Amino acid sequence: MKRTWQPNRRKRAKTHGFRARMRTPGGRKVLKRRRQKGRWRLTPAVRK
Amino acid sequence: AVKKFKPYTPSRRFMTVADFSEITKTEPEKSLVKPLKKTGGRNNQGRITVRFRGGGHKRLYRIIDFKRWDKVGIPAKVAAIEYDPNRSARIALLHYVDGEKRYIIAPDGLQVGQQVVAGPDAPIQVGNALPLRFIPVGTVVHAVELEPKKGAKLARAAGTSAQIQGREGDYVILRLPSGELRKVHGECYATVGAVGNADHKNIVLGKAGRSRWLGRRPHVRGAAMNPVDHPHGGGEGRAPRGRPPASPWGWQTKGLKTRKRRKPSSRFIIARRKK
RNA sequence: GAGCUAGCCCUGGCCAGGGUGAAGCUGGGGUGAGACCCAGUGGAGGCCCGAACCGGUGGGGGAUGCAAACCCCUCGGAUGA
RNA sequence: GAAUGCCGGCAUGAGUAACGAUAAAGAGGGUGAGAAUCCCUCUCGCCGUAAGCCCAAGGGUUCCUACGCAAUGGUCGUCAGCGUAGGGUUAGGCGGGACCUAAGGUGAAGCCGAAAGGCGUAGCCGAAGGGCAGCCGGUUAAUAUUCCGGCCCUUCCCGCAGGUGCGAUGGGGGGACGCUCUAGGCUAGGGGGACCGGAGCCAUGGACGAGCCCGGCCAGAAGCGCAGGGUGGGAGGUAGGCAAAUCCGCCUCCCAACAAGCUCUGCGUGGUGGGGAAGCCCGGGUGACAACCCCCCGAAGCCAGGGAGCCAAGAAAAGCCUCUAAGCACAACCUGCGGGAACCCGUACCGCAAACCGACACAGGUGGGCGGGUGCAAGAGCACUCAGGCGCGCGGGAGAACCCUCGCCAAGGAACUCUGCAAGUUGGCCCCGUAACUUCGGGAGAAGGGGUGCUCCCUGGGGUGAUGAGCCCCGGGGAGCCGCAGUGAACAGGCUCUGGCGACUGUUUACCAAAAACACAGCUCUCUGCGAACUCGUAAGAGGAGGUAUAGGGAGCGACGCUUGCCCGGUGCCGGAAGGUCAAGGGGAGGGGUGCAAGCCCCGAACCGAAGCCCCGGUGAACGGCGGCCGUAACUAUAACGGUCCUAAGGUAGCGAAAUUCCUUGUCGGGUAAGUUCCGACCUGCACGAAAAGCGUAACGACCGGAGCGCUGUCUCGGCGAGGGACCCGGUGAAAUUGAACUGGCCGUGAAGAUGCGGCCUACCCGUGGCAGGACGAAAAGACCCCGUGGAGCUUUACUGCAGCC
RNA sequence: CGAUGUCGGCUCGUCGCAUCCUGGGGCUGAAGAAGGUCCCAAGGGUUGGGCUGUUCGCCCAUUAAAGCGGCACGCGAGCUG
RNA sequence: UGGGAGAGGGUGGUGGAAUUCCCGGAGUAGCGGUGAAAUGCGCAGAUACCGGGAGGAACGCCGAUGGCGAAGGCAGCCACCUGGUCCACCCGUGACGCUGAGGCGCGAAAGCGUGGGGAGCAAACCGGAUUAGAUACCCGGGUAGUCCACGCCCUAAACG
RNA sequence: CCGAGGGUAGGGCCCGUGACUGGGGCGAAGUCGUAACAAGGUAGCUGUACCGGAAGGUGCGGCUGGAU
RNA sequence: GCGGGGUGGAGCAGCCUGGUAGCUCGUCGGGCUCAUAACCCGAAGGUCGUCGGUUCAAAUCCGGCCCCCGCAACCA
Ligand SMILES: [K+]
Ligand SMILES: [Mg+2]
Ligand SMILES: [Mg+2]
Ligand SMILES: [Mg+2]
Ligand SMILES: [Mg+2]
Ligand SMILES: [Mg+2]
Ligand SMILES: [Mg+2]
Ligand SMILES: [Mg+2]
Ligand SMILES: [Mg+2]
Ligand SMILES: [Mg+2]
Ligand SMILES: [Mg+2]
Ligand SMILES: [Mg+2]
Ligand SMILES: [Mg+2]
Ligand SMILES: [Mg+2]
Ligand SMILES: [Mg+2]
Ligand SMILES: [Mg+2]
Ligand SMILES: [Mg+2]
Ligand SMILES: [Mg+2]
Ligand SMILES: [Mg+2]
Ligand SMILES: [Mg+2]
Ligand SMILES: [Mg+2]
Ligand SMILES: [Mg+2]
Ligand SMILES: [Mg+2]
Ligand SMILES: [Mg+2]
Ligand SMILES: [Mg+2]
Ligand SMILES: [Mg+2]
Ligand SMILES: [Mg+2]
Ligand SMILES: [Mg+2]
Ligand SMILES: [Mg+2]
Ligand SMILES: [Mg+2]
Ligand SMILES: [Mg+2]
Ligand SMILES: [Mg+2]
Ligand SMILES: [Mg+2]
Ligand SMILES: [Mg+2]
Ligand SMILES: [Mg+2]
Ligand SMILES: [Mg+2]
Ligand SMILES: [Mg+2]
Ligand SMILES: [Mg+2]
Ligand SMILES: [Mg+2]
Ligand SMILES: [Mg+2]
Ligand SMILES: [Mg+2]
Ligand SMILES: [Mg+2]
Ligand SMILES: [Mg+2]
Ligand SMILES: [Mg+2]
Ligand SMILES: [Mg+2]
Ligand SMILES: [Mg+2]
Ligand SMILES: [Mg+2]
Ligand SMILES: [Mg+2]
Ligand SMILES: [Mg+2]
Ligand SMILES: [Mg+2]
Ligand SMILES: [Mg+2]
Ligand SMILES: [Mg+2]
Ligand SMILES: [Mg+2]
Ligand SMILES: [Mg+2]
Ligand SMILES: [Mg+2]
Ligand SMILES: [Mg+2]
Ligand SMILES: [Mg+2]
Ligand SMILES: [Mg+2]
Ligand SMILES: [Mg+2]
Ligand SMILES: [Mg+2]
Ligand SMILES: [Mg+2]
Ligand SMILES: [Mg+2]
Ligand SMILES: [Mg+2]
Ligand SMILES: [Mg+2]
Ligand SMILES: [Mg+2]
Ligand SMILES: [Mg+2]
Ligand SMILES: [Mg+2]
Ligand SMILES: [Mg+2]
Ligand SMILES: [Mg+2]
Ligand SMILES: [Mg+2]
Ligand SMILES: [Mg+2]
Ligand SMILES: [Mg+2]
Ligand SMILES: [Mg+2]
Ligand SMILES: [Mg+2]
Ligand SMILES: [Mg+2]
Ligand SMILES: [Mg+2]
Ligand SMILES: [Mg+2]
Ligand SMILES: [Mg+2]
Ligand SMILES: [Mg+2]
Ligand SMILES: [Mg+2]
Ligand SMILES: [Mg+2]
Ligand SMILES: [Mg+2]
Ligand SMILES: [Mg+2]
Ligand SMILES: [Mg+2]
Ligand SMILES: [Mg+2]
Ligand SMILES: [Mg+2]
Ligand SMILES: [Mg+2]
Ligand SMILES: [Mg+2]
Ligand SMILES: [Mg+2]
Ligand SMILES: [Mg+2]
Ligand SMILES: [Mg+2]
Ligand SMILES: [Mg+2]
Ligand SMILES: [Mg+2]
Ligand SMILES: [Mg+2]
Ligand SMILES: [Mg+2]
Ligand SMILES: [Mg+2]
Ligand SMILES: [Mg+2]
Ligand SMILES: [Mg+2]
Ligand SMILES: [Mg+2]
Ligand SMILES: [Mg+2]
Ligand SMILES: [Mg+2]
Ligand SMILES: [Mg+2]
Ligand SMILES: [Mg+2]
Ligand SMILES: [Mg+2]
Ligand SMILES: [Mg+2]
Ligand SMILES: [Mg+2]
Ligand SMILES: [Mg+2]
Ligand SMILES: [Mg+2]
Ligand SMILES: [Mg+2]
Ligand SMILES: [Mg+2]
Ligand SMILES: [Mg+2]
Ligand SMILES: [Mg+2]
Ligand SMILES: [Mg+2]
Ligand SMILES: [Mg+2]
Ligand SMILES: [Mg+2]
Ligand SMILES: [Mg+2]
Ligand SMILES: [Mg+2]
Ligand SMILES: [Mg+2]
Ligand SMILES: [Mg+2]
Ligand SMILES: [Mg+2]
Ligand SMILES: [Mg+2]
Ligand SMILES: [Mg+2]
Ligand SMILES: [Mg+2]
Ligand SMILES: [Mg+2]
Ligand SMILES: [Mg+2]
Ligand SMILES: [Mg+2]
Ligand SMILES: [Mg+2]
Ligand SMILES: [Mg+2]
Ligand SMILES: [Mg+2]
Ligand SMILES: [Mg+2]
Ligand SMILES: [Mg+2]
Ligand SMILES: [Mg+2]
Ligand SMILES: [Mg+2]
Ligand SMILES: [Mg+2]
Ligand SMILES: [Mg+2]
Ligand SMILES: [Mg+2]
Ligand SMILES: [Mg+2]
Ligand SMILES: [Mg+2]
Ligand SMILES: [Mg+2]
Ligand SMILES: [Mg+2]
Ligand SMILES: [Mg+2]
Ligand SMILES: [Mg+2]
Ligand SMILES: [Mg+2]
Ligand SMILES: [Mg+2]
Ligand SMILES: [Mg+2]
Ligand SMILES: [Mg+2]
Ligand SMILES: [Mg+2]
Ligand SMILES: [Mg+2]
Ligand SMILES: [Mg+2]
Ligand SMILES: [Mg+2]
Ligand SMILES: [Mg+2]
Ligand SMILES: [Mg+2]
Ligand SMILES: [Mg+2]
Ligand SMILES: [Mg+2]
Ligand SMILES: [Mg+2]
Ligand SMILES: [Mg+2]
Ligand SMILES: [Mg+2]
Ligand SMILES: [Mg+2]
Ligand SMILES: [Mg+2]
Ligand SMILES: [Mg+2]
Ligand SMILES: [Mg+2]
Ligand SMILES: [Mg+2]
Ligand SMILES: [Mg+2]
Ligand SMILES: [Mg+2]
Ligand SMILES: [Mg+2]
Ligand SMILES: [Mg+2]
Ligand SMILES: [Mg+2]
Ligand SMILES: [Mg+2]
Ligand SMILES: [Mg+2]
Ligand SMILES: [Mg+2]
Ligand SMILES: [Mg+2]
Ligand SMILES: [Mg+2]
Ligand SMILES: [Mg+2]
Ligand SMILES: [Mg+2]
Ligand SMILES: [Mg+2]
Ligand SMILES: [Mg+2]
Ligand SMILES: [Mg+2]
Ligand SMILES: [Mg+2]
Ligand SMILES: [Mg+2]
Ligand SMILES: [Mg+2]
Ligand SMILES: [Mg+2]
Ligand SMILES: [Mg+2]
Ligand SMILES: [Mg+2]
Ligand SMILES: [Mg+2]
Ligand SMILES: [Mg+2]
Ligand SMILES: [Mg+2]
Ligand SMILES: [Mg+2]
Ligand SMILES: [Mg+2]
Ligand SMILES: [Mg+2]
Ligand SMILES: [Mg+2]
Ligand SMILES: [Mg+2]
Ligand SMILES: [Mg+2]
Ligand SMILES: [Mg+2]
Ligand SMILES: [Mg+2]
Ligand SMILES: [Mg+2]
Ligand SMILES: [Mg+2]
Ligand SMILES: [Mg+2]
Ligand SMILES: [Mg+2]
Ligand SMILES: [Mg+2]
Ligand SMILES: [Mg+2]
Ligand SMILES: [Mg+2]
Ligand SMILES: [Mg+2]
Ligand SMILES: [Mg+2]
Ligand SMILES: [Mg+2]
Ligand SMILES: [Mg+2]
Ligand SMILES: [Mg+2]
Ligand SMILES: [Mg+2]
Ligand SMILES: [Mg+2]
Ligand SMILES: [Mg+2]
Ligand SMILES: [Mg+2]
Ligand SMILES: [Mg+2]
Ligand SMILES: [Mg+2]
Ligand SMILES: [Mg+2]
Ligand SMILES: [Mg+2]
Ligand SMILES: [Mg+2]
Ligand SMILES: [Mg+2]
Ligand SMILES: [Mg+2]
Ligand SMILES: [Mg+2]
Ligand SMILES: [Mg+2]
Ligand SMILES: [Mg+2]
Ligand SMILES: [Mg+2]
Ligand SMILES: [Mg+2]
Ligand SMILES: [Mg+2]
Ligand SMILES: [Mg+2]
Ligand SMILES: [Mg+2]
Ligand SMILES: [Mg+2]
Ligand SMILES: [Mg+2]
Ligand SMILES: [Mg+2]
Ligand SMILES: [Mg+2]
Ligand SMILES: [Mg+2]
Ligand SMILES: [Mg+2]
Ligand SMILES: [Mg+2]
Ligand SMILES: [Mg+2]
């Protein structure tokens, strides 16, 4: 049937993207936490 | 005279449509339209705050003229009579001898061709605006301001009116459509005449779709829900109200009064509504 | 977290073919004028039949499945909420 | 040594199920160590509104070639979407930027919020919408509207020519719009041709023929031609479009008014540039100097911003034209020509799928465009078929049971069963015909019946053309023909009588319920006078609504017909300046602590003091409620009438063993051979009842009853046949589960149902295909029940707060 | 209770005998024919249908007769639901 | 042709008395009702009296035994549209007439549908009394309706 | 070809007949009340509406076929 | 199982709080009446379901048997 993951590059960048994070106070922490864990990629790889 | 259909489908039996007769212009005045943000019933927070609203028909906002004291003295001719989807009544296009073009709500009796004015010196004739302190007693008027120069806020729907019952200082006694006898400032502009399109209430929507055409989504009763959603929810089988009937939010809906008691307005209300 | 789902908003797109024949209109019958009757036209509708498409009635299959809801036969809606 | 322990390793089930559509295969010839599985040929099969082709999203090198074959490939593998390497994406015109706006987002100003932040007009961002300038062919192993060829066009800068009051983020016009129906003319696209070209062919009895087979066009600036869209001209006045205005708007006189003209588009022509089949020879070469013509059909596409009708009344801004202001008028703008300048990103390949979403090369899901031919009433249905693509990445056998899917059946025909579940019947079109009832629309495809192919003969109108031929489109009458059968195959209703429930089309528990539930037009109550009520929010601010009582909210019922009775004591709600209680506060009679006192300090009665509760009245389409005993009529029986106690008042109309009736298969009638169901009546209604509405009601229903006709493999009662599995061979190879096992019947015994204990009986060792009685078989720490001073959802006149409101 | 699936039907049965039938007897208020009643006997047999989910029951038409029980109220890794 | 009467009809107007209510004065111990009463209202300020206001329906005297219309029926006053009568002159036409199954039209009240309106009155209804009872007659309330428009209904002791 | 008539299907009229249900008629001396005839103790009758155990009652309008 | 209950002929107060049994209808006697109803004046009639206990004394308080109304009888 129609499954849950229906990919969309504009959506993926505009929701979990770096910019969508650096505006909300919560989003910044998420980056901060991912910079503390040494996460190689602070946000998903959106091809744009 | 409303217009009926023959029962050639199950829903045509009772459906009635306006006879549209007094309409003369079959397209609006491009000069005088602006877009209309269809809210669907949601506020800036995006939360719904009025229920069962949306997915209607698209529509442009015919700008309307609720001051008329804008231009005191300048007459104007009745150009056309037009179909507004934004209100119950009909709109009339006026061509001012000023060259200016404006829309007003069409009173009953207005015919395409006549000239109308606005001001202290106006004839007591349908279509004309005057401050209330200058309209005769017991003359039925409409499009009544509420405060001096604040805009026409009263009697703007199909077949409404308002007689002028008395005079008392800088205030006139107004039988509002509801029946509420109220003080209104004499310096409030009003338009002599009853609003036209009186045959509105006799329109029979006829079928559920036509409701939706108006931006009217289905209403669902509390009695049809669960206790989570509504006081009337629950029960095994159908079930009576089982308490004084309530809104989904708790407050009681039968007979419970809600005008704010200490409203400064009260000091000008004379006889709360009838019937 | 609304890239699934549900509602709304904005902007686009889709709906083979066939049947029925509303008001109206024209002419004619009719009358004091009418109401109104007939034929012709016209082509209304959460109208009819039925693909696309949207569904999911009944059955059979399937049941460590082809599939963590699918398959076959049948069945509903299809200018409309 | 156990924790259904944790991690890992290895077993069992087992050479077992399965190897992912029943669209399908066969042989030959190659390559290579190896071939059912790779490449070529030939035959055979399937897709063809697709299983063909072109876009978008997404995927992100999968594209091409060369060399590979460990692993991935459900078998094999020389092959590949796999490994290695090198190659491959070319734009001023196609898409998106340096253009515009939409919902929304953001946000100088301004507002708000403990901080974080929340709003917000202008503005800015934000497209699959507007706007804007490239069409045909060849080339590459792979890119092409991108390269080349041909013919065109766009904008910026600079000069030159002519003209013009030039000039804008400012005014105005325009851009600019719905749904259905639809004209005229074209094109796309098709069908045919006795015509034009074409390498050829004469079989197997006939045919050298107006025979067969193949093809007969593509683009194009200027000019014209055809068909359409758009568009009135002059003057004077002028307070309006927030300055200005010659523009627009408004009023007036003038002519012109189907038109015509100016202007724009589409189609045709058109310099010119291209293509070009079968068939044969080893993607190419010829054919070929290819021809390139005519008639017909014909768009849903194009002229377009066309027309008409309708009601639900159908985006914005920009480019663009116009008007002016500051300015400047050496300028500036316009029209024409010439040169010069024209950037960043995308471009490979998959793309209804083996490359996207589904853990997989997964029978699932995924928007847009083209989708040919013949026949079938039409069509995108159906069968077949071109082009193009396939034969679904295990096969070879066998011809058991059994299972799936399918075919047929004597006599019977629902006797099957909870139920005709299922499966039969019926089927398209044409004409004949067609009941109760009805809201007059309908019921209705009612029901039922006749017709259907082909040959020949005569004749009716229509489109095109020309009024004729030819092509084409609907028809009519008569005379014959063959078969069991002419919608000869495929696609395509079984019907009737009668109940309940819901008016109806609709909606719903994604993944066990589509219904009688939800909704619904419609009826009633009620709130709300606008800074509305109400809703979200701490607020600001929004919705409501740029609405205004013919409106907006809340609630109940639920088309429509006829109706909706009595109770206001309790509960809510509504009205009530008196009365009573009342909190802080007012007040301070009178007391107290203290100090030499002046003082400082505390307690503190009456009396004044909100709403709220009490008190009074109203209110049922507000929450809600609608009795008991006893007696009485020229027979029995039953009580119209009475007696009496109780209530706030005692069930009215209508309906009733019902979606409600317990006793109950109540009794009576209908139907049936037989009827706990069904229909129709009765009424001692356990326990209907009047807007959580009552009694009906045409039409409607994949809803639930009951009867009947037709026809049936449902059944008596089963038989045979087909294919895909099951079975044997080759290849590959899981799974739950599993204390260990050397795992029999009985009758007994045991924690009460023994392969395992006792006694008896029986029994050589091991498999294979089969059946499911047992192993209290598997699966899941019972979902019922209790237990826990375990949880959570839900209610309320449970308790205690809080928001909100007074 | 770290699961023994509950009624009824279908299919296949099998055992008990407290015998529905058929076979053999005594007694009879056994004339005959036909019964009532007890005794022996489990070998075989024990129908089709209407109603209801039904077991059961009633009912129609037959019959030699239309027996009654147990086997986890036999039987869902056999079906039905 | 000229002349007269008349509530004949249709629409648009509009005047005053009175009933009801609302607001204000003033004022108090009752009002109201009947056969006599009670229910009801009133010290939460009634009734009775004065001013202002809201609205509806019906038109005192004239008015009579009257006039008018085919019937049903029609009454304050003003205006517009309009029907049938009657008088006079003997002007015009020249039997053109009488009737009337059918048909069509009008048709008090009540009643019905869709809306408005609603003062007074009042089926149903509630209460107080009477009564053996009183589902009545009388009194206190009171809903449709009575009224305007539109569409049905078509009955009568529609009678002289 | 037609055709007695046989059969299939659907219609119209009429007669019988039916659980039960509606009133009607009659029935020597049944129960309730007392509506009408006297102003029948509220004058009656009427069309119509609603209501009540029943006769009746009330409302709106109409008739005198009503008395002093 | 839990709750209420039985009293002149009919139907009901009195029970809780012991001593007194009461209201209406009817039955009877007499009145008005031509007569019946109504209506008026009088009078009768109750050992309080039953047996036992408490008490000085029981319709009244308790217990047992009888009989009548009402509610409950659920989960699988
Ligand atoms: K339970
Ligand atoms: Mg989905
Ligand atoms: Mg889908
Ligand atoms: Mg996933
Ligand atoms: Mg995207
Ligand atoms: Mg998106
Ligand atoms: Mg982002
Ligand atoms: Mg965000
Ligand atoms: Mg922060
Ligand atoms: Mg790194
Ligand atoms: Mg992140
Ligand atoms: Mg009108
Ligand atoms: Mg009609
Ligand atoms: Mg209209
Ligand atoms: Mg605009
Ligand atoms: Mg809005
Ligand atoms: Mg916002
Ligand atoms: Mg709301
Ligand atoms: Mg909403
Ligand atoms: Mg309007
Ligand atoms: Mg409105
Ligand atoms: Mg005012
Ligand atoms: Mg109207
Ligand atoms: Mg309405
Ligand atoms: Mg709308
Ligand atoms: Mg609604
Ligand atoms: Mg609803
Ligand atoms: Mg529910
Ligand atoms: Mg609640
Ligand atoms: Mg409830
Ligand atoms: Mg419920
Ligand atoms: Mg429910
Ligand atoms: Mg219930
Ligand atoms: Mg409540
Ligand atoms: Mg509130
Ligand atoms: Mg969504
Ligand atoms: Mg998505
Ligand atoms: Mg659209
Ligand atoms: Mg469609
Ligand atoms: Mg069509
Ligand atoms: Mg027609
Ligand atoms: Mg027309
Ligand atoms: Mg339809
Ligand atoms: Mg299904
Ligand atoms: Mg089926
Ligand atoms: Mg299975
Ligand atoms: Mg499953
Ligand atoms: Mg399927
Ligand atoms: Mg539909
Ligand atoms: Mg739509
Ligand atoms: Mg241990
Ligand atoms: Mg384990
Ligand atoms: Mg563990
Ligand atoms: Mg582990
Ligand atoms: Mg390891
Ligand atoms: Mg291992
Ligand atoms: Mg092995
Ligand atoms: Mg083996
Ligand atoms: Mg095995
Ligand atoms: Mg498989
Ligand atoms: Mg598999
Ligand atoms: Mg298939
Ligand atoms: Mg396939
Ligand atoms: Mg198959
Ligand atoms: Mg196929
Ligand atoms: Mg070799
Ligand atoms: Mg090999
Ligand atoms: Mg091979
Ligand atoms: Mg082979
Ligand atoms: Mg193969
Ligand atoms: Mg190959
Ligand atoms: Mg095809
Ligand atoms: Mg996208
Ligand atoms: Mg390999
Ligand atoms: Mg190998
Ligand atoms: Mg290697
Ligand atoms: Mg592999
Ligand atoms: Mg695989
Ligand atoms: Mg091999
Ligand atoms: Mg290999
Ligand atoms: Mg090799
Ligand atoms: Mg490449
Ligand atoms: Mg630049
Ligand atoms: Mg922009
Ligand atoms: Mg942004
Ligand atoms: Mg764009
Ligand atoms: Mg472009
Ligand atoms: Mg081009
Ligand atoms: Mg110029
Ligand atoms: Mg400009
Ligand atoms: Mg527009
Ligand atoms: Mg558009
Ligand atoms: Mg073309
Ligand atoms: Mg063709
Ligand atoms: Mg030969
Ligand atoms: Mg060309
Ligand atoms: Mg001007
Ligand atoms: Mg090649
Ligand atoms: Mg299209
Ligand atoms: Mg148009
Ligand atoms: Mg429309
Ligand atoms: Mg805008
Ligand atoms: Mg100069
Ligand atoms: Mg640049
Ligand atoms: Mg490319
Ligand atoms: Mg597909
Ligand atoms: Mg596609
Ligand atoms: Mg592929
Ligand atoms: Mg999956
Ligand atoms: Mg994996
Ligand atoms: Mg595969
Ligand atoms: Mg083709
Ligand atoms: Mg054809
Ligand atoms: Mg066809
Ligand atoms: Mg195959
Ligand atoms: Mg075999
Ligand atoms: Mg057979
Ligand atoms: Mg038969
Ligand atoms: Mg049957
Ligand atoms: Mg059977
Ligand atoms: Mg049945
Ligand atoms: Mg079936
Ligand atoms: Mg019939
Ligand atoms: Mg008929
Ligand atoms: Mg009949
Ligand atoms: Mg049809
Ligand atoms: Mg038929
Ligand atoms: Mg037909
Ligand atoms: Mg024939
Ligand atoms: Mg033939
Ligand atoms: Mg078929
Ligand atoms: Mg059909
Ligand atoms: Mg329905
Ligand atoms: Mg209905
Ligand atoms: Mg639902
Ligand atoms: Mg479900
Ligand atoms: Mg669920
Ligand atoms: Mg689920
Ligand atoms: Mg689910
Ligand atoms: Mg359901
Ligand atoms: Mg359905
Ligand atoms: Mg519903
Ligand atoms: Mg409905
Ligand atoms: Mg209704
Ligand atoms: Mg707004
Ligand atoms: Mg409304
Ligand atoms: Mg509402
Ligand atoms: Mg409805
Ligand atoms: Mg409902
Ligand atoms: Mg009450
Ligand atoms: Mg009350
Ligand atoms: Mg009360
Ligand atoms: Mg009620
Ligand atoms: Mg209750
Ligand atoms: Mg109560
Ligand atoms: Mg008797
Ligand atoms: Mg009644
Ligand atoms: Mg009954
Ligand atoms: Mg029963
Ligand atoms: Mg029954
Ligand atoms: Mg019933
Ligand atoms: Mg019941
Ligand atoms: Mg029963
Ligand atoms: Mg029976
Ligand atoms: Mg009975
Ligand atoms: Mg009920
Ligand atoms: Mg209710
Ligand atoms: Mg109910
Ligand atoms: Mg109710
Ligand atoms: Mg009817
Ligand atoms: Mg019906
Ligand atoms: Mg019905
Ligand atoms: Mg259904
Ligand atoms: Mg049933
Ligand atoms: Mg049958
Ligand atoms: Mg069979
Ligand atoms: Mg056989
Ligand atoms: Mg086979
Ligand atoms: Mg062998
Ligand atoms: Mg392998
Ligand atoms: Mg061992
Ligand atoms: Mg034992
Ligand atoms: Mg044992
Ligand atoms: Mg043993
Ligand atoms: Mg042992
Ligand atoms: Mg042993
Ligand atoms: Mg031992
Ligand atoms: Mg043995
Ligand atoms: Mg085996
Ligand atoms: Mg077993
Ligand atoms: Mg087992
Ligand atoms: Mg287990
Ligand atoms: Mg489980
Ligand atoms: Mg556990
Ligand atoms: Mg447990
Ligand atoms: Mg506890
Ligand atoms: Mg405990
Ligand atoms: Mg607890
Ligand atoms: Mg939970
Ligand atoms: Mg708080
Ligand atoms: Mg257990
Ligand atoms: Mg159980
Ligand atoms: Mg004998
Ligand atoms: Mg049993
Ligand atoms: Mg039984
Ligand atoms: Mg015998
Ligand atoms: Mg068991
Ligand atoms: Mg068992
Ligand atoms: Mg048992
Ligand atoms: Mg048992
Ligand atoms: Mg078993
Ligand atoms: Mg089972
Ligand atoms: Mg079972
Ligand atoms: Mg008297
Ligand atoms: Mg008093
Ligand atoms: Mg006082
Ligand atoms: Mg009033
Ligand atoms: Mg003369
Ligand atoms: Mg003469
Ligand atoms: Mg009337
Ligand atoms: Mg009448
Ligand atoms: Mg008379
Ligand atoms: Mg015969
Ligand atoms: Mg009498
Ligand atoms: Mg009397
Ligand atoms: Mg009288
Ligand atoms: Mg009387
Ligand atoms: Mg009465
Ligand atoms: Mg007591
Ligand atoms: Mg005492
Ligand atoms: Mg006494
Ligand atoms: Mg004693
Ligand atoms: Mg329970």
Side-chain angles (χ1 to χ4, degrees), chain A residues 1 3 9 14-15 17 25 36 38 48:
Chain A
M1 62 198 65
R3 292 307 163 182
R9 309 184 179 205
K14 233 168 181 59
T15 315
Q36 193 165 340
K48 301 165 183 67

Side-chain angles (χ1 to χ4, degrees), chain B residues 63-78:
Chain B
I63 301 196
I64 318 288
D65 178 4
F66 291 132
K67 321 236 280 188
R68 299 199 44 155
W69 52 261
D70 203 302
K71 36 214 321 100
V72 219
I74 310 171
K77 186 173 67 178
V78 172

Side-chain angles (χ1 to χ4, degrees), chain B residues 10-177:
Chain B
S11 3
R12 288 288 144 174
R13 321 198 74 110
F14 332 101
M15 213 179 220
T16 75
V17 284
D19 65 354
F20 287 137
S21 296
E22 309 234 351
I23 301 266
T24 64
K25 201 169 170 310
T26 82
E27 274 289 314
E29 197 58 72
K30 174 183 185 186
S31 163
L32 280 172
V33 304
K34 62 175 56 182
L36 205 47
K37 158 70 190 184
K38 238 161 61 169
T39 72
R42 290 157 190 72
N43 71 332
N44 37 13
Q45 303 167 335
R47 308 288 195 95
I48 296 166
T49 130
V50 171
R51 319 180 298 157
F52 324 111
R53 312 264 277 188
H57 191 287
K58 202 172 199 185
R59 44 155 83 156
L60 282 70
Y61 173 54
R62 278 72 162 159
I63 301 196
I64 318 288
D65 178 4
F66 291 132
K67 321 236 280 188
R68 299 199 44 155
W69 52 261
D70 203 302
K71 36 214 321 100
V72 219
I74 310 171
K77 186 173 67 178
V78 172
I81 283 172
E82 300 179 25
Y83 172 84
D84 197 339
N86 301 125
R87 62 190 36 82
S88 80
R90 297 320 192 204
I91 58 176
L93 177 63
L94 298 171
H95 286 167
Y96 273 77
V97 309
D98 220 12
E100 183 141 27
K101 292 191 189 184
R102 288 173 174 201
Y103 274 138
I104 60 152
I105 17 191
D108 198 88
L110 232 73
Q111 291 278 335
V112 36
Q114 88 172 74
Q115 251 190 188
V116 298
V117 71
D121 34 69
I124 304 313
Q125 196 57 81
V126 257
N128 293 307
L130 323 82
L132 273 158
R133 80 188 306 246
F134 308 121
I135 306 192
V137 268
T139 21
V140 12
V141 313
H142 71 264
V144 196
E145 285 195 303
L146 187 58
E147 280 163 300
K149 311 298 179 302
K150 283 201 189 192
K153 308 283 269 164
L154 302 183
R156 326 191 328 188
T160 77
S161 43
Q163 292 187 217
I164 321 179
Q165 297 297 105
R167 268 187 190 162
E168 184 177 351
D170 319 345
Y171 278 109
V172 306
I173 297 310
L174 247 198
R175 178 211 289 168
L176 302 178

